[PDB]
């Protein structure tokens, strides 16, 4: 059916692979210790075009730890497109322009089946609350990556199109030159019975490194949480600057929050960077802003997240809004190493700022919330009348004071 399916089973212990049952028409697995599932669906469509599109969804509230076979997706539902002629207005979200792409962002899950080209329907178990999705649309191919966790016994059989399965375990590594070892199996085209599995070894140097284990390298703090402009403080005093390592904070903010890009050197802000206009004056321009902010090593770095004024409505109340910036250190590596692995590939996103030969070390992703109150839109008449009456009385009193005879 012009479908190709690739399944990846990331385990934690070598003995866990023993528990895997290989029946003549499938593979039955019972979870042992928080294994990871990576599903890759590939389609071929004509779709004559010369642009790339990315649709990445990661649950903001998700607490799942990233694996070596998964990229660090930007939190929330994001759509990037590098085309400079088509218009991006899906779901009523105004795009944000950047020298490489137009981007749409949201913090709540949206339906994806209406965006997938060709009107293709397939047996996808959309589980937005417990899975991470990444859809890549190319000139002639469509790829769908789903990262999930197994919490129950599952049986994999011959799905639509060609099917290939691979179970891997992470051997000894030094957070570089990562080696996976395990089994690879394929499904016959003429029958629903599995083939003969073979030993396989994959060697690759990742460009997405996770150091989120322990040792509180760069603690994150938030001060003035109740205030309108809470301060985000990052501690890098104990870490010395390296030759090619530069730390950064990447934040996708809504239209009600902006960052003064002149606070720190080497900060880039795309979208609504206006420092004066309120929320109701720039709400319809775009969905917000994307900011990448550099940090100075050896000293505490402070970032201010200002908030605008919201349009008054009936029954005055506050409109708390949250966002999650991510802290990552980017290091340049010589242009000889092959920074390519079969699992994930570079594409549009926050990686488009940096070059091709970069490696990211993700440290912390502490989330922030801002409370913004608005008044009641029923006191306009009272305010008008009181203000004008007071002003008129004051000028009348001053005029009376002026007319006083001399001597």
């Amino acid at each position: 059916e012009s479908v190709r399916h690739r399944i990846a089973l990331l385990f934690a212990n070598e003995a866990d692979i023993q528990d895997v049952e290989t029946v003549e028409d499938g593979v039955i697995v019972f979870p042992n210790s928080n294994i990871t599932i990576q599903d890759r669906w590939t389609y071929a469509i004509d779709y004559e075009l010369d642009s790339i599109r990315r649709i990445s969804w990661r649950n903001p509230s998700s607490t799942r730890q990233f694996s070596v076979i998964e990229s660090r997706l930007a939190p929330g539902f994001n759509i990037y497109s590098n085309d400079k002629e088509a218009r991006l207005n899906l779901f009523g979200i105004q795009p944000v322009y950047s020298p490489m792409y137009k981007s749409l962002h949201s913090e709540t899950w949206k339906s994806i089946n209406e965006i997938l080209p060709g009107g293709k329907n397939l047996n996808i178990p959309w589980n937005p609350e417990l899975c991470d999705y990444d859809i890549l649309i190319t000139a002639n191919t469509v790829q769908v990556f789903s990262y999930c966790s197994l919490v129950e016994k599952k049986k994999f059989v011959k799905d639509a199109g060609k099917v290939e399965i691979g179970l891997f375990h992470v051997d000894t590594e030094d957070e570089e030159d990562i080696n996976l070892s395990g089994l690879r199996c394929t499904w016959e085209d003429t029958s629903n019975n599995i083939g003969k599995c073979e030993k396989t070894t994959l060697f690759y140097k990742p460009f997405h490194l996770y150091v989120d284990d322990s040792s509180d390298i760069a603690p994150i703090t938030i001060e003035n949480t109740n205030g309108l402009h809470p301060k985000m403080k990052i501690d890098l005093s104990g870490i010395r600057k390296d030759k090619d390592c530069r730390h950064f904070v990447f934040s996708q903010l809504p239209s009600e929050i902006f960052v003064d890009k002149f606070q720190s050197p080497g900060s880039i802000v795309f979208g609504l960077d206006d420092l004066e206009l309120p929320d109701y004056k720039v709400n319809s321009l775009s969905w917000g802003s994307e900011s990448i902010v550099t940090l100075k090593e050896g000293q505490i770095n402070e970032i201010t997240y200002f908030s605008r004024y919201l349009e008054p409505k009936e029954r005055a109340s506050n409109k708390t809004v949250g966002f999650e910036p991510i802290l990552f250190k980017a290091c340049q590596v010589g242009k000889e190493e092959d920074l390519s692995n079969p699992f994930y590939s570079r594409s549009l996103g926050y990686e488009a700022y940096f070059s091709e030969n970069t490696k990211f070390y993700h440290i912390n992703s502490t989330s922030v919330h801002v409370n913004i109150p608005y008044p009641n839109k029923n006191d306009i008449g009272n305010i008008e009348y009181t203000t004008f009456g007071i002003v008129v009385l004051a000028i009348c009193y001053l005029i009376y004071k002026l007319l006083r005879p001399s001597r």
Partner: protein, 407 residues
């Protein structure tokens, strides 16, 4: 005892130096950023100018380009505190001009007693003015210019007075309000020496022509150099401004609510009429006794007080606009001590109440927009109006015993 003028100047210089050293040491060591945001804006504009680029690329920079040109030695010479030194020098020049003005006036107009030291120390020995000058605020420079042209009017140097008046008008648009009184004085200033209307009218035309030509030449030169953005950000902003951030002004909440609405109310476009009416009414009092410099100074002080009080925006930095004129008003004042104490107490109490409401709103997110902020603004405006009326009564009483000592 009686302080010596030389000793007063020396102690003022010592205070300025000590505060500057405090500032530089605290900036270097403490992570509190004593320097104000305005100095950061000016420094960024100076950097843009030094890199052969328009200073208006820096957001929220609406000053004239001359400020950035003056601060250029920040980047021409590798230091950051040069603007602070220039502002401190301007503040010292302002104090010296105040002392010289009082000394010259005491020998031409009959005065009550000897009070040069106290009235000079009102400005030269104020930690508030010291903090304003040493934090990078540029107001002092404007203040200096003002005194300069006024001094040129005292010593019958009308041409340089007109040139400096035009320069100050170019720097900030508000000194235009001084045009109506000063002109009258100039005419009378020549009627008491030469009994020929021709010479006085010619001198008035000369000073008007000089100030107009200086203003127009500076405007044309700046526009030609820096494009339409200069004209926009310098002139049209005051026309399309929608300042809604909390401030001492009475029109704050009204302007916020009006900016919320898409169509302005009919009785909401006359926010400029009361200010013009009261300014003209206060200006007309100069006719009581022309050819008098103390009366002119009092009229200018009342005009500045009324303009700041009725302005659509008013913060803690707008007070200095009239504080410079405080000594000349208070040299021959007749207010009882209890009345002055009452005025000061009411002023400070209203300011403290508004500051508490604003701090609650900013650092706690509470909804104190309609009931809290508006009432505090109304109370502050009423107190300011009462103080202005009292000062007008004071100047009307003063105008009596300010006879000349002509032979």
């Amino acid at each position: 005892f009686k302080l010596g003028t030389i000793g007063l100047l020396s102690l003022a210089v010592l205070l300025r130096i000590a505060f500057f050293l405090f500032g530089v040491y605290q900036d270097e060591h403490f992570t509190v950023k004593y320097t104000d945001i305005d100095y950061q804006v000016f420094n960024d504009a100076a950097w843009f100018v030094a890199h052969r680029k328009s200073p208006y690329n820096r957001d929220t920079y609406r000053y004239t380009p001359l400020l950035s040109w003056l601060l250029l030695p920040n980047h021409m010479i590798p230091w950051f505190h040069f603007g602070k030194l220039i502002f401190v020098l301007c503040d010292l020049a302002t104090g010296v001009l105040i002392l010289q003005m009082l000394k010259k006036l005491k020998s031409k107009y009959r005065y009550g007693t000897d009070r040069m030291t106290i009235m000079a120390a009102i400005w030269l020995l104020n930690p508030m003015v010291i903090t304003i000058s040493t934090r990078g605020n540029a107001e002092s420079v404007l203040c200096f210019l003002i005194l300069s042209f006024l001094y040129c009017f005292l010593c019958e140097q009308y041409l340089l007075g007109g040139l400096l008046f035009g320069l100050s008008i170019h720097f900030k648009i508000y000194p235009i309000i001084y045009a109506l009184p000063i002109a009258i004085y100039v005419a009378a200033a020549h009627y008491n020496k030469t009994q020929s209307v021709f010479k006085s009218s010619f001198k008035l035309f000369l000073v008007g022509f000089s100030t107009l030509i200086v203003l127009i030449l500076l405007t044309v030169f700046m526009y030609m150099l820096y494009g339409d953005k200069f004209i926009d950000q310098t002139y049209l902003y005051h026309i399309y401004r929608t300042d809604h951030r909390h401030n001492f002004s009475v029109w704050n909440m009204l302007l916020y609510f009006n900016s919320a609405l898409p169509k302005t109310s009919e009785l909401s476009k006359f926010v400029f009429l009361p200010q013009m009416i009261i300014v003209l009414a206060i200006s007309l009092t100069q006719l009581r006794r022309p050819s008098s410099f103390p009366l002119l100074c009092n009229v200018l002080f009342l005009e500045t007080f009324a303009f700041v009080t009725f302005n659509k925006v008013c913060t803690s930095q707008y007070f200095i606009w009239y504080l410079i004129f405080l000594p000349f008003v208070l040299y021959n004042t007749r207010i009882s001590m209890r009345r002055g104490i009452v005025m000061l107490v009411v002023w400070v109490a209203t300011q403290a109440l508004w500051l508490r409401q604003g701090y609650l709103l900013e650092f706690e997110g509470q909804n104190v927009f309609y009931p809290g902020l508006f009432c505090a603004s109304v109370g502050f405006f009423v107190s300011n109006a009462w103080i202005l009326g009292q000062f007008i009564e004071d100047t009307i009483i003063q105008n009596d015993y300010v006879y000349r000592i002509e032979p």
